């Protein structure tokens, strides 16, 4: 990334500066003594003369222009603009990040924080609704049938994904919301937690998309069959839903650990180990979209005849089926800012997908409405 490269370059350049100072004769012979502030590498200069000190290229913020020489003024002993830490670090400082790129500093942070506080609260609402759904469905009499069993367990998958995302948010914040200031390096114990949280959250994502695929396949098979299911296939569906992410997330984790080990596995550098993890999600989305178009082609036929009228029902049916199959992602793939507006839409929909599915497939339907009414009448 950037922190690791900066630290390594600082190590590999500070030792050279120290060796150069050891090669140089003593800077105390009526000369400006060099201060080991682990930053400026100014050699011995004449007493009270502003030596032409060139800013080193060890700073990653100087990739485009790695040359900057300015006059540094020192005292007869070497007392430049210092005092305690450094009033102005002698007289050389303009070689840092320029104001041209300052637009990305303290300005994109506001929109990043807005998106953050939006999607975290969306995930919190989603997980709360899903927990309520499990409480009113999983623990109640509607638990043995395959349909609501898969629905509840997919709700659990959404819960896992949302909890993992929220937990990793907290970790990442506490990797950088603790700057030791004069800081050495980050704690090793937190690195393992970051890595395990990242792999767990990737597993949650892949499990969620895999179970969207499972729901699509189950619906398509149920509608294609000429009668009730003779065999549950519940074990097969559970296996293809749980183990399939483990066929990808574990290989991705081991490849990241052995080949591109970094401070946290959240960061992605080479697409080679990212496509191997995106592929199951893309395949699930494609197959689920095909199942969606097939089911729409079937549903229009069931409404074009034998019914008394109808576009409202067809439109309502489509809007109550896309979140269950999660086929709206393909629309974003096909798709006034090309960045800001797009991101906001996609992240909002992704965060609120769990909330909408929980409120749609566990509270609105009559098979739960009548049961809840009876339970409340009894209580």
């Amino acid at each position: 990334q950037v922190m690791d490269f900066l630290f390594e370059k600082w190590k590999l350049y500070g030792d050279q500066c120290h060796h150069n100072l050891s090669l140089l004769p003593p800077p105390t012979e009526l000369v400006c003594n060099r201060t080991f502030d682990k930053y400026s590498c100014w050699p011995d200069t004449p007493a009270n003369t502003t030596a032409n000190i060139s800013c080193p290229w060890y700073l990653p913020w100087h990739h485009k222009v790695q040359h900057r020489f300015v006059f540094k003024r020192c005292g007869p002993d070497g007392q430049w603009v210092r005092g305690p830490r450094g009033q102005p670090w002698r007289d050389a400082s303009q070689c840092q990040m320029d104001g041209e790129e300052i637009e990305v500093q303290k300005e994109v942070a506001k929109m990043y924080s807005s998106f953050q506080v939006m999607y975290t609260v969306g995930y919190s609402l989603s997980l709360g609704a899903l927990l309520l759904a499990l409480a009113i469905l999983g623990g109640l009499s509607k638990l043995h049938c395959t349909r609501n069993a898969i629905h509840a367990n997919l709700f659990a998958s959404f819960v896992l994904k949302a909890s993992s995302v929220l937990v990793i948010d907290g970790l990442l914040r506490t990797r950088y919301s603790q700057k030791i200031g004069d800081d050495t390096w980050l704690s090793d114990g937190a690195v393992a937690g970051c890595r395990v949280a990242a792999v767990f959250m990737q597993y949650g994502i892949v499990a969620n998309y895999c179970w969207l695929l499972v729901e699509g396949l189950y619906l398509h098979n149920l509608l294609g069959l000429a009668t009730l299911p003779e065999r549950s296939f519940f074990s097969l569906y559970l296996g293809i839903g749980w183990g399939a992410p483990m066929l990808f997330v574990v290989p991705w984790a081991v490849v990241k650990c052995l080949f591109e080990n970094v401070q946290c596995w959240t960061s992605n550098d080479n697409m080679g180990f990212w496509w191997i993890l995106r592929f199951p999600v893309f395949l699930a989305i494609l197959i689920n979209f095909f199942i969606f178009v097939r089911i729409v082609q079937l549903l229009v036929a069931k409404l074009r005849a034998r019914q008394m009228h109808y576009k409202f029902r067809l439109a309502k049916s489509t809007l109550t089926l896309i979140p269950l199959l999660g086929v709206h992602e393909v629309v974003f793939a096909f798709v006034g800012t090309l960045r800001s507006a797009k991101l906001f839409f996609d992240l909002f929909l992704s965060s609120f997908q769990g909330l909408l599915v929980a409120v749609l497939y566990c509270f609105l339907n009559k098979e739960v409405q009548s049961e809840l009414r009876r339970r409340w009448h009894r209580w």
């Binding site: 630290f7 502030d37 840092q96 990442l172 950088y176 700057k179 004069d182 800081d183 960061s267 992240l347």
Partner: peptide, 29 residues
């Protein structure tokens, strides 16, 4: 699958911001 891209971009943004912090204290001192 853009959530992974978003969180990778987030991590990179935090890293470049921490680099600013590192070079700040170094230059100051």
């Amino acid at each position: 699958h853009s959530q992974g891209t978003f969180t990778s971009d987030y991590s990179k943004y935090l890293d470049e911001q921490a680099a600013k912090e590192f070079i700040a204290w170094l230059m100051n001192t």
